[PDB]
Amino acid sequence: KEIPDVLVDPRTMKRYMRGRFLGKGGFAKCYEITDMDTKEVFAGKVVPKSMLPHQKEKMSTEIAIHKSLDNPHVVGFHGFFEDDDFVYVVLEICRRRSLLELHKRRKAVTEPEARYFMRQTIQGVQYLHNNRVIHRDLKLGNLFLNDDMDVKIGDFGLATKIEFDGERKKTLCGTPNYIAPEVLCKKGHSFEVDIWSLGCILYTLLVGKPPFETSCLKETYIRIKKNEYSVPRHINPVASALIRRMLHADPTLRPSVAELLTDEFFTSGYAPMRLPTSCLTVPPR
Numbered sequence: 001k002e003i004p005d006v007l008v009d010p011r012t013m014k015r016y017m018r019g020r021f022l023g024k025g026g027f028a029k030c031y032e033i034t035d036m037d038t039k040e041v042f043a044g045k046v047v048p049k050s051m052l053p054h055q056k057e058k059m060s061t062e063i064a065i066h067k068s069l070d071n072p073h074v075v076g077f078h079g080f081f082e083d084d085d086f087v088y089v090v091l092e093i094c095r096r097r098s099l100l101e102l103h104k105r106r107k108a109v110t111e112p113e114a115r116y117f118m119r120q121t122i123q124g125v126q127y128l129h130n131n132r133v134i135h136r137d138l139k140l141g142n143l144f145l146n147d148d149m150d151v152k153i154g155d156f157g158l159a160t161k162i163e164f165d166g167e168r169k170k171t172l173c174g175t176p177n178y179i180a181p182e183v184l185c186k187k188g189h190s191f192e193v194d195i196w197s198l199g200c201i202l203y204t205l206l207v208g209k210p211p212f213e214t215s216c217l218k219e220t221y222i223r224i225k226k227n228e229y230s231v232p233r234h235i236n237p238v239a240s241a242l243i244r245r246m247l248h249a250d251p252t253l254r255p256s257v258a259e260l261l262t263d264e265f266f267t268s269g270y271a272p273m274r275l276p277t278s279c280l281t282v283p284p285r
């Protein structure tokens, strides 16, 4: 099979010129796409129908969740369509890869950087929770970056919208390093699983590795359910205090999203409003 050079849909009847390769992942291949008449640039997720009513239901709910979203810290959803072979998701273009690639090249980042990255990310998470959306898959590889180094939360493939007040979800899903203990135990979970994952993100940024990172997958899960981790003594007491709270065994003792923004960690030290593109490879001066 070969993905068409011009992407056309029955609905909008727009044409997208398939350009440069951006990356691949969970049964999807992303390309830089340009509307041939207005010259607007987007990211086009192209997924084969051979990869797909069981898997097709999990994608159609992702689209429905992502479509209803509009926020400066969330990857913009600009439309979806399918021909006879491929499903085309049209997204906001994020040319600065993800926070995972920054992490691999940089290792532990500086304190002001984590303030910037976490703040923008939490502002996105707050928006999601205000609209009753639980992401459930928050990690460095899902926090995308644009040319201005703005964080863009993406991939809502494991996301869920809640309707009634005290709904508790039961699906066991996520990424090993970031999955909340209540999700592994399958007892039931809600909004505070995103706070846990955020705590894993903050730890990883300041320390240089995930808190429950192990060579064995089975061990990692045991560490999480037993709440077995340690923040190194070299980390600022304020940041470690916040990390300990976000990674609490009891979901009800974790800070709310609103409580995160007004934390001492975000109000004490230097918090830059902008980060240069040099942060992708070297520490900022």
Ligand SMILES: Nc1ncnc2c1ncn2[C@@H]1O[C@H](COP(=O)(O)OP(=O)(O)O)[C@@H](O)[C@H]1O
Binding pocket: 022, 023, 024, 025, 026, 027, 028, 029, 030, 043, 045, 075, 091, 092, 093, 094, 095, 097, 141, 144, 154, 155
């Ligand atoms: N909105 C986007 N803008 C630019 N590139 C993207 C975007 N979303 C995904 N990509 C590219 O696709 C790769 C994997 O992304 P991911 O979202 O994990 O794939 P999937 O859509 O299968 O979940 C990344 O390396 C990234 O370069």
